[PDB]
Amino acid sequence: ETSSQPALHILTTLQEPHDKHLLDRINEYVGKAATRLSILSLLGHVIRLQPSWKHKLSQAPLLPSLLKCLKMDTDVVVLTTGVLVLITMLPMIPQSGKQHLLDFFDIFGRLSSWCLKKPGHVAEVYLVHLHASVYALFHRLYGMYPCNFVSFLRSHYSMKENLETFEEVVKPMMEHVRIHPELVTGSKDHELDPRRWKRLETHDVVIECAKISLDTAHHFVIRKTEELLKKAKGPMEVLDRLIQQGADAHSKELNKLPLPSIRTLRDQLLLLHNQLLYERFKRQQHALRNRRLLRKVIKAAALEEHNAAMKDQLKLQEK
Amino acid sequence: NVGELLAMLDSPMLGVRDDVTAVFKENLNSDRGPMLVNTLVDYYLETSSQPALHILTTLQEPHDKHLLDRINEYVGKAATRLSILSLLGHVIRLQPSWKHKLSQAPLLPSLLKCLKMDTDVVVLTTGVLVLITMLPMIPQSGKQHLLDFFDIFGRLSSWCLKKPGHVAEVYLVHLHASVYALFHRLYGMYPCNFVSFLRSHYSMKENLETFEEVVKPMMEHVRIHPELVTGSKDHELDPRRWKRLETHDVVIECAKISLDPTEASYEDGYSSGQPPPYDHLFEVALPKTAHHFVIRLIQQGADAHSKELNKLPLPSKSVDWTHFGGSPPSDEIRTLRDQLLLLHNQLLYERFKRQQHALRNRRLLRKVIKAAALEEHNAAMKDQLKLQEK
Amino acid sequence: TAEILRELSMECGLNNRIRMIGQICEVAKTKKFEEHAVEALWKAVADLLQPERPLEARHAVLALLKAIVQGQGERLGVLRALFFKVIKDYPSNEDLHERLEVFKALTDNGRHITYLEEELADFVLQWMDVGLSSEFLLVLVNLVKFNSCYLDEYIARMVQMICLLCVRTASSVDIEVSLQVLDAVVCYNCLPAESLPLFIVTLCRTINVKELCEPCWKLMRNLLGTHLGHSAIYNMCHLMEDRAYMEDAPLLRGAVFFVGMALWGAHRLYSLRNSPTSVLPSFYQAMACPNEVVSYEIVLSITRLIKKYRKELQVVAWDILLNIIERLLQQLQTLDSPELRTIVHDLLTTVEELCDQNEFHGSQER
């Protein structure tokens, strides 16, 4: 009724049995339809602050209740709220992967297909927020369970009924993630071992996720990334050099000529740096060709060839 | 005697050089025996003659076989391997129409024999540059030499750490850059195969040391290859895959993963109230912001730094024998001459990537013309359809 | 080269600098220069490209550059970028012919543009404005023919400039070559929709000169056959229709000629799915302001329409085409030319013949 911060501070630091009563009442209000969005917002705000009971979320019925909501409901606001709540929870309860890995993956796939379908009965702004949440979920899952999540991606987006979902939604996300080192040193059950998750605090899970992450909906996540980071934190030259170096080198050769008519090592050092300047100029030219190619492919990307063929079919009203 | 004409092949008068060049081309056309090619190769080895190099690099059939045969013969012989491999690199980068013959000629087995069973880091670095150049020219050689490529990568990446006893650190910067380029090439061309090989050969207890010190930094510089989701271990080696792609297309396939412009340039890879009630969670959900609000990296640039004389073991960074004069120790002169030859080959490899990107820049024009044409063609057909409704 | 730098460098007198630079030009195109000597010679005369030195010194150093390109050539490498930077980023603006002579040798008339590929795109525009000269348009033909791949962002602007050179230049061979430049843009690249209307206007204007007639039609054929053909036909039709363009007779001669030629002329290009039934109403307004030579083109093109497509002209089309003839006849009173009288009479005679043949299917009453 209030969104009162001091009451939220009371709630974030409860203890037994009031601890149990809080999670029970949150779970009840997630079960019912009317209270669902309100209590999901409370859950998000409380969980953001790492409450005293942060490790009891891993086994309370509230986590299944949230996941059930995220797999059954269609309210985009409720779905977005719950997804962001879940993403916030994963570093706090990473052990729950061993229980609900398939539910996390089901939620990711379902809402990726949602981002693909885009029901217009709900606003485009809400769907962009939902896609940003799905992007955050992809990043969080790939960071926390790399081999498991890659296996899910391969097994779920190599299916013919989701390859379009893949290319249109998920494949752009793969541009923003490095190859996870646990794809060479890890295992599937190594990402569900409770000991590994206990050896890392909430921050360390997020740091590891960030180690493999990089940086229209992509415009939204870029803008929101820069904004929140502002809250968090405050070639011709090469050619011009190489011609001079060559003139000097020919001068050196002109100094050799009087001798038949230590300096050797300086001569070799300058000659070597001349080759580095050549290689640097080549790298700049290569980068320029590349930037030109990025431009060309951007302007070739727009493709309605299917619609053009369909218009050819209707053009056969020539018949 | 052809030897006299050789002496005039590098004549100070351009007319005489072109006379010898034209006479040599006529002889090559007339006589299908390898003798002319062998004489050219031997003379080039003794002179590094540019016009002779051009005559060698412009050869067509049947002398393509003779060129490959003499190059293979000398590549085996370690006493001339460095020079003959430089000649082979020149031949390869020109991309002759018999480029696809590289997948089966006996020369490629000799090159992999060198790169897997030799110790001169000058030669190994040169050979890795040549192999990275040749891989996109014959990407179909996956199913034939995949594990050879993988094992060479592993061996030389362990060499980047284990510091052979006779090798000054300068060569190991070159070698690490070359192996990094090979890493990019292999992981771009064969993503699933290379990832599985990485898991198998670097979950090993005896190679985890090399992994942590050498390869994990390389892993920081590449995206996840989308073929880890869409590809197959059989698919990457299937020639049905590579039949569509020219050399530059394979180079850009490798570029699709790269985070490092100093080796490979990325391209064409993948792409309530005033706030909403959930907005404050983006703070802790989106990846790079969450790093801060949760309530609590140089691989080829290193070679540039070394050649910019910025950082190394101290005499190997900037020793200077001028302080007390005389003549330098000839070992230092050799060390720079070797480093110069390595940088020369590295420069040629960058020239190759430049050429390939230029070629793709040309091909993408032919693509873009059709793209734009059809883009307007869509509305034009809408107009035609409306007119036909009328 | 050796110690001759003593006579090439700034220490020696300018007359002797030029003398020895001529003697260098002769070895530059005939002797195998020792390595790195190109930039040494260049360093010895890089200041000869300075205005206080007369144009003789500039010509002598540009001749040195050209001779070095001619002889040493494929061994220049990055020195190609150096020379092209010199020619483009010129420390003057006066000389064009000699700089173009160096550039022609540097790119083999415009087919060999390695290492200068990116900056050539800006150089094209800069030189065009500095001069749309003749030989430069030869070079531009070769450039678009083989190396359009780097002019991609500027093809729009190149066409917009070339449209406004083809409208006005006393040198006939200038447009004889400009047609070739556009032929290259048409055949080895493609024109933006923001450039096509002005291309249409400039082509329609351009055909009106007798020596250029067949080349201009060849160019129009090469474009009108592409995908742009349909947009072009519709734009030509709307150039017939809009009230603002009404008075422009020479433009409308082009418009009538090309539309009729493409859809129903002898060298018709079959990709145009535009029915004559939908185009003849634009020929309606092509006569909203009578003229003594535009309507000659109308009657000739309609002569080929009727004499060929006798049967495809059905009754709604004939109801239009008879009004076309009605306007032509109302004009026949005052256009007065014996040739127009003759051709209009021949047209009506052929309509009469086709009526006796019953190849005419239109309204006999009207």
Q: What is the DSSP string of C28-41?
A: HTTB-PPTTHHHHH
For A246, nearest residue in chain C (alpha carbons): C36
CB atoms within 10 A of CB C196: 18
Q: Which residues in chain B have their CB less than 8 angstroms from residue C30's CB?
A: 13-15
Nearest chain A Cα to C1, which residue?
A: A254
Spell out the residues 6+ positions from residue A283 whose beta carbon is closer than 8 angstroms to its own.
B261, B262, B350
Most distant CA pair in chain C, distance: 98
Rg of chain C over Cα atoms, rounded to whole angstroms, equals: 28
CB contact under 8 A, C82 and A243: yes
Q: How far is CA A171 from the centre of its chain?
A: 11
Partner residue facing B378 (CB), from A88, A129, A311: A311
CA distance A265 to B48: 22
User: Which residues of C are less than 8 Å from B14 in CB distance?
Assistant: 29-32, 71
Pairwise CA distance, residues A2 & B383, whole Å: 59
**CB B64 within 8 Å of CB B101:** yes
Distance of residue C347 Cα from the nearest chain A Cα, in angstroms: 31
Cβ–Cβ under 8 Å, residues C28 and A245:
no
Decide: residue A37, CB within 10 A, 0-12 exposed, 13-18 middle, 19+ buried.
buried
Residue among C180, C84, C191 at smallest CA distance from C135: C180
Closest residue in B to C151 (Cα) is B365
* Contact: B17, C32; criterion CB under 8 Å: yes
Burial of A292 (0-12, 13-18, 19+ CB in 10 A): buried
Which of B62, B137, B150 shows the shortest CA–CA distance to B103? B137
Q: Which residue of A has its CA nearest to C76?
A: A243
Residue pairs between chains A and B whose CB atoms are closer than 8 Å: 295
Measured between beta carbons, the chain B residues lying within 8 angstroms of C226 are 373
Q: How far is CA C175 from the centre of its chain?
A: 7
Number of CB atoms found within 10 A of residue B129's CB: 25
User: How deeply is C315 buried, as exposed, middle or buried, from its count of CB atoms within 10 A (0-12, 13-18, 19+)?
Assistant: exposed
CA-based nearest residue in chain C for residue B390? C278
Local structure of residue C210 (DSSP, 8 states): G
Cis peptide before A17 (omega within 30 of 0): yes
Q: How many helices (H) and strands (E) does chain C have?
A: 18, 0
Closest CA to A276 of C104, C190, B307: B307
Of C222, C334, C322, C321, the closest CA to residue C271 belongs to: C222
B390 Cβ under 8 Å from any chain C Cβ: yes
A58 touching chain B per CB within 8 A: no
Q: What is the resolution of this structure in A?
A: 2.9
Q: Do A184 and B202 touch (CB under 8 A)?
A: yes
Among the partner-chain residues A87, A268, A297, the one whose CB lies closest to the CB of B333 is A268
Distance CA C222, CA C189 (A): 12
Is residue C251 within a helix (H) or strand (E), and if so which, with residue range?
Answer: helix C249-264
Interaxial angle between packed helices A305-315 and B330-389, expressed in degrees from 0 to 180 and rounded to the nearest 10: 30
Task: Give the nearest partner residue to B377 out of C31, C149, C227, using CB atoms.
Answer: C227
Contact C1/A247 with Cβ under 8 angstroms? no
Given CB atoms, is B354 within the 8 Å cutoff of chain A? yes
Kindly report the length of chain C. Answer: 366
* Residue B17 contacts C where some CB pair is shorter than 8 Å: yes
Whole-angstrom distance, CA of residue B355 vs CA of residue C81: 15
C65 in Cβ contact with C49 (< 8 Å): no
> Is the Cβ of A243 closer than 8 Å to some Cβ of chain C?
yes
Nearest to A45 by CA among A77, A15, A74, A6: A6
Q: In angstroms, rounded to a whole number, what is the distance separating the alpha carbons of residues C95 and C66? A: 14
Interchain proximity C227–B390, CB inside 8 Å: no
Contact list in C for residue A236 (CB cut-off 8 A) is 85
Say if CB A66 and CB A46 are below 8 A apart. no
Return the HEC string of chain B: CHHHHHHCCCCCEHHHHHHHHHHHHHHHHHCCCCHHHHHHHHHHHHHCCHHHHHHHHCCCCCHHHHHHHHHHHHHHCCCCHHHHHHHHHHHHHCCCHHHHHHHCCCHHHHHHHHHHCCCCHHHHHHHHHHHHHHCCCCHHHHHHHHHHHHHHHHHHHHHHHHCCCCCCHHHHHHHHHHHHHHHHHHHHHCHHHHHHHHHHHHCCCCCHHHHHHHHHHHHCCEECCCHHHHCCHHHHHCHHHHCCCCHHHHHHHHHCCECCCCCCCCCCCCCCCCCCCCHHHHHHHCHHHHHHHCCCCCCCHHHHHHHCCCCCCHHHHHCCHHHCCCCCCHHHHHHHHHHHHHHHHHHHHHHHHHHHHHHHHHHHHHHHHHHHHHHHHHHHHHHHHHHHHC
Bond before B62 cis per omega within 30 degrees: yes
Rg over CA atoms, chain B: 26
Contacts of A257 in chain C (CB under 8 A): 2
Tokens of B365: 């024009």
Contact by Cβ (8 Å): B117, B129: no
CB-based contact A249 C36, cutoff 8 Å: yes
Gapped junctions in chain A, after residues (C–N > 2.5 Å): 215, 234, 261
Give long-range contacts, CB 8 A cutoff, 24+ apart: C56-59: C56/C18, C57/C14, C57/C17, C57/C18, C58/C92, C58/C94, C58/C95, C58/C98, C59/C95, C59/C98
CB B192 within 8 A of CB B236: yes
Closest residue in B to A137 (Cα) is B285
CA distance A41 to A63: 15
What is d(CA C211, CA C226) in angstroms, rounded to the nearest whole number?
25
- Token pair in block for residue B220: 């920081």
Q: Which has the closest alpha carbon to C274: C220, C334, C328, C233?
A: C233
Tokens of B328: 């330098």
Helix axes C213-224, C249-264, angle to 10 degrees: 60
Residue A65's Cβ-count burial label (10 Å; 0-12, 13-18, 19+) is buried
CA distances from C359 to A275, C308, C309, C314, C320 (A): 80, 11, 10, 10, 17
3-state secondary structure chain A: CCCCHHHHHHHHCCCCCHHHHHHHHHHHHHHCCCCHHHHHHHHHHHHHCCCCCHHHHHCCCHHHHHHHHHHHCCCHHHHHHHHHHHHHHCCCCHHHHHHHHHHHHHHHHHHHHHHHHCCCCCCHHHHHHHHHHHHHHHHHHHHHCHHHHHHHHHHHHCCHHHHHHHHHHHHHHHHHEECCCHHHHCCCHHHCCHHHHHCCCHHHHHHHHHHCECCCHHHHHHHHHHHHHHHHCCCHHHHHHHHHHHHHHHHHHHHHCCCCCCHHHHHHHHHHHHHHHHHHHHHHHHHHHHHHHHHHHHHHHCCCHHHHHHHHHHHHHHC
- Give the chain C residue whose CA is nearest to the CA of A257: C2
Q: Which of B328, C308, C128, B374 is nearest to A310 (CA)?
A: B374
For residues B171 and B303, give the distance between their C-alpha atoms in angstroms, rounded to a whole number: 10
Chain A residue with minimum CA distance to B325: A262
Residue C49 DSSP class: S
Closest CA to A91 of A210, A202, A221, A223: A202
Q: How far is CA A185 from CA A121, A150, B213, C68, C126, in A?
A: 46, 14, 14, 59, 57
After which residues does chain C show a gap where C to N exceeds 2.5 Å?
A: none
Among the listed residues B272, B278, B274, B275, the one whose alpha carbon sits nearest the alpha carbon of residue A47: B278
Residues of chain A contacting residue B228, judged by C-beta atoms under 8 Å apart: 150, 153-154
Long-range contacts of A183-187 (CB under 8 A, 24+ apart): A183/A146, A183/A147, A183/A150, A183/B195, A183/B198, A183/B199, A184/B195, A184/B198, A184/B199, A184/B202, A184/B203, A184/B211, A184/B215, A184/B219, A185/B199, A185/B202, A185/B203, A185/B208, A185/B211, A186/A146, A186/A147, A187/A147
Nearest to C36 among A250, A257, A281 (CB): A250
- The CB-side HSE value for B297 (13 A sphere, CA atoms) comes to 4
C32 to B369: CB separation less than 8 angstroms, yes or no: no
CB atoms under 10 Å from CB of C344, counted, come to 23
Environment class of C215 (CB within 10 Å of its CB; exposed 0-12, middle 13-18, buried 19+): middle
CB contact under 8 A, C78 and A278: yes
Q: Cβ separation of C227 and B376 shorter than 8 Å?
A: yes
Candidates A185, A187, A146; CA nearest to B211 is A185
Tokens 């790195």 belong to C36
Indicate the helix (H) or strand (E) that contains C218. Answer: helix C213-224
Compute how many other C-beta atoms are within 10 angstroms of the C-beta atom of residue A5. 9
Task: Compute φ and ψ for B294, nearest 5 degrees.
Answer: -60, 130
Neighbours of chain C (3+ CB pairs under 8 A): A, B
Contact present, B349 and A283 (Cβ < 8 Å): no
| Best CA proximity match to A140, nearest among A165, A176, A116, A166 | A176
Residue in B224, B360, B377 nearest the CB of A178:
B224
Q: Alpha carbon of A163 to those of A132, A166, A171, A221, A306: distances in Å?
A: 20, 5, 10, 23, 17
Query: Rounded CA gap, A36 and A59, in Å?
Result: 20
Pick the residue from chain A with its C-alpha nearest to B340.
A272
Spatial distance between the Cα atoms of C155 and C195, rounded to a whole number of angstroms: 9
Q: Does B372 touch chain C (CB under 8 A)?
A: yes
Q: Measure Cα distances from C5 to B209, B365, C17, C40 in Å.
A: 58, 46, 10, 8
Which among A239, A278, A318 is the nearest to C82, CB-wise? A239
Residue window 141-170, chain A: list those with CB within 8 Å of chain B: 143, 150, 153-154, 157-158, 163, 166, 170
Q: Token pair for residue B285?
A: 């959900």
Tokens of C148: 């359009």
Q: Is-contact C264 C301, C-beta < 8 A?
A: yes
Token look-up 């495809």 returns C312
B81 CB contacts (<8 Å, ≥6 apart)? B74, B75, B114, B118, B123
Neighbours of chain B (3+ CB pairs under 8 A): A, C
What's C112's DSSP letter? Answer: -
The DSSP secondary-structure symbol of C169 reads -
Instruction: Say which residues have a Cβ less than 8 Å from residue A6's Cβ, sequence separation at least 6.
Output: none
Identify which of A50, A48, A43 has the alpha carbon closest to the alpha carbon of residue A22: A43
Sequence-distant (6+) residues with CB within 8 A of B103 are B138, B140, B141, B144
From B255, B296, B343, residue closest to A272, measured CB to CB:
B343
Contact B377, A308 (CB under 8 A): yes
Report how far apart, in Å, the C-alpha atoms of B97 and of each of A61, A293, B200, B293 are.
Answer: 68, 25, 38, 58
Whether C136 and C95 have beta carbons less than 8 Å apart is answered as no
Structural contact between residues B293 and A91, judged by C-beta atoms closer than 8 angstroms = no
Alpha carbons B49 and B378: distance in angstroms, whole number: 57
Q: Measured between beta carbons, which residues in chain A are less than 8 angstroms from residue C3?
A: 254
Cβ neighbours around A237 below 10 Å, total: 11
Alpha carbon separation from C187 to C4, C121, C179, C364 (Å, rounded): 50, 19, 12, 46
Note whether C230 contacts B384, CB cutoff 8 Å.
yes
Neighbours of A305 (CB within 10 A): 13
C-beta atoms surrounding B110 within 10 Å: 21
Tell me, yes or no, if C293 comes closer than 8 A to chain B by beta carbon. no
d(Cα B362, Cα B160) in Å, to the nearest integer? 38
Report residue A193 as tokens.
């071992």
Q: In angstroms, what is the C-alpha Rg of chain A? A: 29
How many Cα atoms occupy the beta-carbon half-sphere of C243 within 13 Å? 0
Q: Which residues of A touch B226 (CB under 8 A)?
A: 171, 174
Q: After which residues is chain B broken (C to N over 2.5 A)?
A: 271, 296
